[PDB]
Ligand binder design. Structure first.
Ligand SMILES: Cc1ccc2c(c1)nc(CCc1ncc3cccnn13)n2-c1ccccc1
Ligand SMILES: [Mg+2]
Ligand SMILES: [Zn+2]
Length: 324
């Protein structure tokens, strides 16, 4: 199945050092990798290097690995390379701003996880591949895209001279692999409402023990979710254009349903362009706000995320009310 990088690509990636005008920019939560496509692979390296030092991974091996991940992201409008890095960056901003709650082992596990979390995404929904009647969905029947996503990483990781977790004890590897597993799975949005109702509880009966593992796995889970939707937390004009990027996928899925004589839901129906504003308000309200609210509640330093959400919400509001 697998795709790999060439020497050209990877040895260009080592040779990259990030401009200085972008160093403080990158440490923000609202930061926008938008105009630096060019730089994306290197940004991922820069972040890895700061978080986990410049000797967690053999540079040669990490570079090769990052570029190959890239080679496996399909050219789809939203669930593509750009989505992976944006998400990763966000996880970086969170790791950096809680610089003592997480292990070196999670920090690297997690940034890796994000980069890989939507690997080989087709631009179709779990729903859609189950609904009718895909081969991928006749092997992973639950959280389909997500399991695939994980299988990809794991095959990439095992490719010749890509394994970046090599120099770890074979049960410290059988550990960071286990982190990444749950990490990516947690981004099955269906899983999130359960997971977030659970946390909400724990916190508010003062019973959330970060010492207990299954507790860790939950918060991690929410963090992944939180990064996964973080489009909502960039500044308004950024967020606007990312939304355009999402419906392009949805409307494509929805068009393929129509083609088969059927009624796509309102979200994936393009003949409903201008229901979107409210759609968004809806999303924000039942999804985003509770997400960032519960993550702000657990990890207070991430409040800058909740604030950019609120700011965006009332921008979609002005839009629905007719004043933007
Ligand atoms: C006509 C219409 C209708 C509903 C819609 C909609 C458009 N759009 C959405 C949400 C769309 C979405 N799914 C992931 C992301 C990530 C960033 C931004 N949006 N977004 N819902 C919605 C709203 C509430 C709950 C679930 C989905
Ligand atoms: Mg996903
Ligand atoms: Zn994703």
């Amino acid at each position: 199945h697998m795709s790999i990088c060439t020497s050209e690509e990877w040895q260009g990636l080592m040779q990259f050092t990030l401009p200085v005008r972008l160093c403080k920019e990158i440490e923000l939560f609202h930061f926008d990798i938008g105009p630096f496509e060019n730089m994306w692979p290197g940004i991922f390296v820069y972040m890895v290097h700061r978080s986990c030092g410049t000797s967690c991974f053999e540079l040669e091996k990490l570079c090769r690995f990052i570029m190959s991940v890239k080679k496996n992201y399909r050219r789809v409008p939203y669930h593509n390379w750009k989505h992976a890095v944006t998400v990763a960056h966000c996880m970086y901003a969170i790791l950096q701003n809680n610089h003592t709650l997480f292990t070196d082992l999670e920090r690297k596990g997690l940034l890796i996880a994000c980069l890989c979390h939507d690997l080989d995404h087709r631009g179709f929904s779990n729903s859609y591949l189950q609904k009718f009647d895909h081969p991928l969905a006749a092997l992973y029947s639950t959280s389909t895209m997500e399991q695939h996503h994980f299988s990809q990483t794991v095959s990439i990781l095992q490719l010749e001279g890509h394994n970046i977790f090599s120099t770890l004890s074979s049960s410290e590897y059988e550990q960071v692999l286990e982190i990444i597993r749950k990490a990516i799975i947690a981004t099955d949005l269906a899983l999130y409402f359960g997971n977030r109702k659970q946390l909400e509880e724990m916190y508010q009966t003062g019973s959330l023990n970060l010492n207990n593992q299954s507790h860790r796995d939950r918060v991690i889970g929410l963090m992944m979710t939180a990064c996964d939707l973080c489009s909502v937390t960039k500044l308004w004009p950024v967020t606007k254009l990312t939304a355009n990027d999402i419906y392009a996928e949805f409307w494509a899925e929805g068009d393929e349903m129509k083609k088969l004589g059927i009624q796509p839901i309102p979200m994936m129906d393009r003949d409903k362009k201008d229901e979107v504003p409210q759609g968004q308000l809806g999303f924000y309200n039942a999804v985003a706000i509770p997400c960032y609210t519960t993550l702000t509640q657990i990890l207070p330093p991430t409040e800058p995320l909740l604030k950019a959400c609120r700011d965006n919400l009332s921008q979609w509001e002005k839009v629905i009310r007719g004043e933007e």
